[PDB]
Amino acid sequence: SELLVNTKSGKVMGTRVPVLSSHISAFLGIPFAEPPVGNMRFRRPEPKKPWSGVWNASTYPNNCQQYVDEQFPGFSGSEMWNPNREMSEDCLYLNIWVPSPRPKSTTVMVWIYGGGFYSGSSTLDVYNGKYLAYTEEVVLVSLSYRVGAFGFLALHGSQEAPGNVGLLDQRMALQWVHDNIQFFGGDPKTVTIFGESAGGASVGMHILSPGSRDLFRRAILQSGSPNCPWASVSVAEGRRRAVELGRNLNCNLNSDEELIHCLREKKPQELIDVEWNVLPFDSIFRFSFVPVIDGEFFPTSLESMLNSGNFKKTQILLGVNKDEGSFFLLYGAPGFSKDSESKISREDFMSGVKLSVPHANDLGLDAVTLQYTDWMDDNNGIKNRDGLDDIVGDHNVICPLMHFVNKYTKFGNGTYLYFFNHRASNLVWPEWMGVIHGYEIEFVFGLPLVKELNYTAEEEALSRRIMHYWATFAKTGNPNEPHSQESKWPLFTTKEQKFIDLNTEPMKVHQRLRVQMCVFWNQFLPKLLNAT
Amino acid sequence: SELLVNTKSGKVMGTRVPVLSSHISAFLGIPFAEPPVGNMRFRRPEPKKPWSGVWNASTYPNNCQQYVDEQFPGFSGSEMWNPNREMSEDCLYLNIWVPSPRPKSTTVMVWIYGGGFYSGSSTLDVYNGKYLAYTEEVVLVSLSYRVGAFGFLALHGSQEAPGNVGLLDQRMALQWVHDNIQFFGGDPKTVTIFGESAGGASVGMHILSPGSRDLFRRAILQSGSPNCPWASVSVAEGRRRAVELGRNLNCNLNSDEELIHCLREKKPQELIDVEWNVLPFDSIFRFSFVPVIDGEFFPTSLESMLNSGNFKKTQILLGVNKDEGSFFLLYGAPGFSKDSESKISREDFMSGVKLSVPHANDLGLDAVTLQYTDWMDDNNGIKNRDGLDDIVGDHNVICPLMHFVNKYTKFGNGTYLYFFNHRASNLVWPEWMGVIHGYEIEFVFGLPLVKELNYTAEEEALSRRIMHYWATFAKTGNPNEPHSQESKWPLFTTKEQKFIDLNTEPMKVHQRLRVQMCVFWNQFLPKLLNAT
Ligand SMILES: COc1c(C(=O)CCC2CCN(CC3CCCCC3)CC2)cc(Cl)c2[nH]ccc12
Ligand SMILES: COc1c(C(=O)CCC2CCN(CC3CCCCC3)CC2)cc(Cl)c2[nH]ccc12
Ligand SMILES: *[C@@H]1O[C@H](CO)[C@@H](O)[C@H](O)[C@H]1NC(C)=O
Ligand SMILES: *[C@@H]1O[C@H](CO)[C@@H](O)[C@H](O)[C@H]1NC(C)=O
Ligand SMILES: *[C@@H]1O[C@H](CO)[C@@H](O)[C@H](O)[C@H]1NC(C)=O
Ligand SMILES: *[C@@H]1O[C@H](CO)[C@@H](O)[C@H](O)[C@H]1NC(C)=O
């Protein structure tokens, strides 16, 4: 049968779903690991043991246990990121969309969701793989992984809670794809991994990690990279946060076993309830339980690996949006509101930068402030707002990614760089927020192709050219097809450093993306913080 | 007799000189001090003891002993600054231009020359007082003072070479004006001191020093100010350089008396020959023998005085030229030439900043570099040239002065600020040097009124409006003729921070002269260097 597939662990039965006046095949909620429940909380994932009978792969799986956003209840702009089904620790599932009829040896694309390593789900509406899988005739997979403490509680030296298990989940799903995607008409030799924000960083992390390199061919990174400040911690810091988590729940802290055993008796939301409390600073764009530089998943520091060329060498396609920072100011910085234009006072601006660069000393703070203040106009609330937006975005996303793109291109086999700066005509967030962190995503997934979503002709065309770039890249390592000149996306090189704008307008080529700000963030500021 | 004048120290005979189809009285080379010779080199100046008979004050006196610049022999652009008279240690004289007929009790303006405290002459063609005295009917006085080692060798504790004696020369000349200016028709209660560069700095130094305040009514500062980084040194540094000067001359260094004795037997030119060797670093815009923060001419640190309001409260009129830096790059930095466009390579631009901020640590150097480099275009030889020009001008003149004008204004009784940015139509220096340090002087002194000098009609008009400002300010404390037609130069207030452009175009008001850069020099950079 087309819907019935015998995999290396059992038979699964999928469903025929419609898409754009046609249909494709969907297999939802296939398990790829043993339920990381009970005594297996915090432990490495174990491969899903073979089942007898047919697995109902007809409906989305549970979502992983995560903090749930309630700032704006009812509000679609924030609620679209929240879990859209039951939360459970039994959440290690993946989903597959196969074009109908089933192709032979076609290109595979594995989605990896963001959410700052504390949240995120594969079952979200924006990650509906049907449009992209159908329009671009690729086998589309979306995996899942443990988030928050469940995924990234790190007590180095313990084999009970080593850290990074959330990335290991992703690896096991990648390993599952390598073993079974051929049964779905997928070529396991042509797998492109891709993800946004935290998902972006994850993609990069699998590039660096040796135990991950052979489980995929190429990589797309959207608005995230492995070296992001919010995206990892030392073993010392992971331990400290872990120990501090026990403290918030009256746990025994004399040993890891006692500490771990304690945290395992607690219910999931008990952990989540106190999760934010282990952060060292009052901060924004910082998350408690994130990957650790352990010496195992990552043999040595990210920078050194980047320097020595110790990573997977292939093609990467990567980029950022114009206003990466606004979402996080709204949730964590004074003066910002979803309902005003959020002109920021000088006072809230100063307040802002302190939250944004939580680890800086006073000289570092003055440096950042100077770097973003127009002194002919320091009490301009609009410039102060856009300034703070750029500080958050440049520091957490754009500049970390550029450092990565420059480092990778020395050893890579082809880099493509984009700047996404279209603002959706139907955005429900206020104008001041601009081109928001996460909002290129709906374009990648072909959401503008559906008429009821009320996008414009030009946005549908944009999404269509975007999906094509994505998939074409995925099959060939080049987002370009050999005709027109309308237009060719240039290769990013060490010398000329080209990239392209992604919007409704005809393609423009620029050079040196946010280089002025990024020299500050990548070279001056770090040298300054080390020095002082 | 108009030309014969009985002063407190003896009779004096001047001479009738022609000016612009008319005539005025000059009194050239009037002594105000005992010749600081022999046992009195380095020593405080002593008043000129009374003479018999009639002094022939009809010719220009000697110029003080100084480094003569031989870079462009024959070239008028450099040679206009060199000694136009014989050099000697017997140089403590002043010059007076008196309207004809002699005014009853008219405004007095005393000129103090620049030259980095190492050079300078009262007798220069460009400091010729006849036009200004004549046109605005003021009594114009030209003082002099010992420069370099002779004027500013400082060995704290010693009474033989205490430091600051050249500032004391100035004071003594001011004292002479106080005692004798009435005999020329001048009001000793209405004396404006003015000077450019070192003169400008000196003018503010008298503003600060308690023992100089009662010797003048108000102050004009052009392209210099007391807080300039080149304009003073500490006791420690001052001694170290003095001791080093003796080391370069095989002097006994075992005590101040044996060092001073050794340096006193040397011919002046021997001193000057090694003068530059005692500088701490390879630098531009640095000079070896300058005023000392000594606890006597300056009771406390210059910055503490400005803070406490410890200084003369009167009116000041002050400003800068658009390209303070070019003159010094030409004599000091790689890539700069009188005869090319001096487009600067990135490597030379690097060398430039190290030469220009010779006290910065590496972090400091990185900050300056970042602050002035456009990283989309870093190999632009013009942008690198202009940028290094701005670095020099902003660091050494513009930003010091803005610091001064802001601090002063909190206690002052009226501030006027100008940005001089006209390039003379007949400049002999290359186009790339722009509006040069010291080239507003010829406009202040009325040289464009003389037809054979070949200034344009618009430049003569500019000199006239500029002289009227300086004079009107000197008479009333305000450059504007109140309730007259012409547009009015606004007060600089700590809130609005207004100033004007000075050029051939109608007047423009602006606010916050070079804030962005001066915030960096005055606030950020010193914080960076103070850290460890
Ligand atoms: C949960 O809210 C916070 C934060 C935040 O960082 C909120 C900003 C995120 C909220 C949701 N959204 C998620 C992404 C997921 C991947 C694709 C793009 C959208 C945007 C970012 C910070 C602190 Cl300190 C908080 N404290 C309490 C709640 C809370
Ligand atoms: C003598 O030059 C130097 C320097 C300098 O930085 C000074 C260059 C000056 C040349 C004369 N010029 C005229 C001024 C006079 C005052 C009014 C305005 C115009 C100003 C610039 C530095 C070093 Cl290390 C030197 N070594 C040898 C000569 C020399
Ligand atoms: C799979 O589960 C769905 C959801 O409950 C159900 O409607 C469907 O009938 C099931 N399929 C089979 C073959 O049992
Ligand atoms: C990719 O690898 C091939 C084979 O080694 C090489 O010829 C090609 O130049 C590489 N491309 C890039 C952009 O590095
Ligand atoms: C003053 O000096 C000038 C020039 O040297 C000379 O012509 C004049 O005669 C002198 N005056 C007297 C009274 O000797
Ligand atoms: C100057 O001082 C006088 C006398 O105290 C005062 O009336 C006047 O307002 C002052 N002017 C300024 C500009 O400070």
Between CA A168 and CA A33 the distance in angstroms is 10
Between CA B142 and CA B88 the distance in angstroms is 18
User: Do B459 and B503 form a contact (C-beta atoms < 8 A)?
Assistant: no
Environment class of residue B454 by beta-carbon count within 10 Å: exposed (0-12), middle (13-18) or buried (19+)?
exposed
User: Do B191 and B177 form a contact (C-beta atoms < 8 A)?
Assistant: yes
Q: What are phi and psi of A112, to 5 degrees?
A: -125, 110
How many residues in total does chain B contain? 532
Q: What is the DSSP string of A284-351?
A: SS--SS--B--SSSSSS-HHHHHHHT-S--S-EEEEEETBTTHHHHHHHSTT--SSS--PPPHHHHHH
Asked if residue B284 has its Cβ within 6 Å of ligand 2, the reply is yes
Q: B188 is written with which tokens?
A: 């000793």
Write down the catalytic residue from B89, B136, B196, B324: B324
Give rounded-to-5 percent helix, strand, coil for chain B.
40, 20, 45
Sign of CA dihedral B273, B279, B281, B282: negative
Between CA B205 and CA A135 the distance in angstroms is 78
User: Do B518 and B398 form a contact (C-beta atoms < 8 A)?
Assistant: yes
Considering only CB atoms, which chain A residues are within 8 Å of B366? Answer: 523-524, 527
Which positions ≥6 away from A225 have C-beta within 8 Å?
A200, A201, A204, A231, A318, A397, A400, A401, A403, A404, A405
CA distance, residue A405 to nearest chain B CA (Å): 17
Diameter of chain B measured on Cα atoms: 73
User: Do B488 and B365 form a contact (C-beta atoms < 8 A)?
Assistant: no
**3-class secondary structure, A32:** coil
Q: Is the peptide bond before A342 cis (omega within 30 degrees of 0)?
A: no
For residues A337, A343, A348 and A350, what is the CA-based torsion angle, rounded to 10 degrees? 130
Q: A282 is written with which tokens?
A: 């009052």
Search chain A and give the residue with CA nearest B527: A363
CA distance, residue B335 to nearest chain A CA (Å): 25
Q: B250 is written with which tokens?
A: 């095989």
3-state secondary structure A130-156: HHHHHHCCCEEEECCCCCHHHHHCCCC
Q: A23 is written with which tokens?
A: 């249909």
**3-class secondary structure, A7:** strand
Q: Please give the DSSP secondary-structure letter assigned to residue A45.
A: P
Which positions ≥6 away from A453 have C-beta within 8 Å?
A426, A447
Cite the DSSP H helix spans in B38-79.
Answer: 76-79
Sign of CA dihedral B115, B120, B125, B131: positive
CA-wise closest residue to B223 among B351, B60, B392:
B392
Q: B427 is written with which tokens?
A: 């400049």
CA distance, residue A360 to nearest chain B CA (Å): 14
A375–B516: do the CB atoms touch at under 8 Å?
Answer: yes
User: Do B143 and B459 form a contact (C-beta atoms < 8 A)?
Assistant: no
For helices A381-393 and A362-372, the axis angle rounded to 10 degrees is 120
Q: What are phi and psi of A287, to 5 degrees?
A: -135, 145
Asked if residue B437 has its Cβ within 6 Å of ligand 2, the reply is yes
Cite the DSSP H helix spans in B128-254.
Answer: 130-136, 148-152, 165-180, 198-208, 235-247
Q: Please give the DSSP secondary-structure letter assigned to residue B226.
A: T
Q: What angle do CA B47, B48, B53 make, to 5 degrees?
A: 155
Q: What are phi and psi of A31, to 5 degrees?
A: -80, 145
Search chain A and give the residue with CA nearest B517: A375
CA-wise closest residue to B169 among B124, B225, B113, B128:
B113
Between CA A432 and CA A335 the distance in angstroms is 13
Note if B1 is an active site residue.
Answer: no
Cα–Cα distances (Å) from B323 to B175, B327, B387, B432, in that order, read 35, 9, 11, 10
Between CA B244 and CA B254 the distance in angstroms is 12
- For residue B27, the surrounding DSSP H or E stretch is strand B22-31
Query: What is the domain partition of chain B in residue ranges?
Result: 1-532
Neighbour count for residue A23 (Cβ, 10 Å) = 15
Write down the catalytic residue from B395, B403, B422, B437: B437
Topology annotation, domain B1-532: Rossmann fold (3.40.50)
Between CA B102 and CA A225 the distance in angstroms is 82
Between CA B224 and CA B200 the distance in angstroms is 4
**Chain B interface residues (partner A, CB cutoff 8 A):** 363, 366-367, 370, 374-376, 511-512, 515-516, 519-520, 523-524, 527-528, 531-532
Structure resolution, Å: 2.6
Considering only CB atoms, which chain B residues are within 8 Å of A515? Answer: 375-376
Give which of B379, B527, B532 to mutate to test A binding, by max A Cβ within 10 Å. B527
User: Do B458 and B443 form a contact (C-beta atoms < 8 A)?
Assistant: no
Neighbour count for residue B300 (Cβ, 10 Å) = 13
Q: In the structure, which protein residues have their CB atom closer than 6 angstroms to any atom of ligand 3?
A: A 13, 56, 58-59
Q: A326 is written with which tokens?
A: 């606004």
Considering only CB atoms, which chain B residues are within 8 Å of A375? Answer: 512, 515-516, 519
CA-wise closest residue to A391 among A512, A280, A285:
A285
Q: What angle do CA B468, B474, B478 make, to 5 degrees?
A: 75
A532–B531: do the CB atoms touch at under 8 Å?
Answer: yes
CA-wise closest residue to B398 among B426, B430, B363, B435:
B435
Which positions ≥6 away from B529 have C-beta within 8 Å?
B359, B360, B361, B364
Cα–Cα distances (Å) from B190 to B105, B131, B171, B474, in that order, read 9, 20, 16, 7
Between CA A439 and CA A401 the distance in angstroms is 18
Between CA B326 and CA B309 the distance in angstroms is 34
Query: A132: CA distance to ligand 1 center in Å?
Result: 27
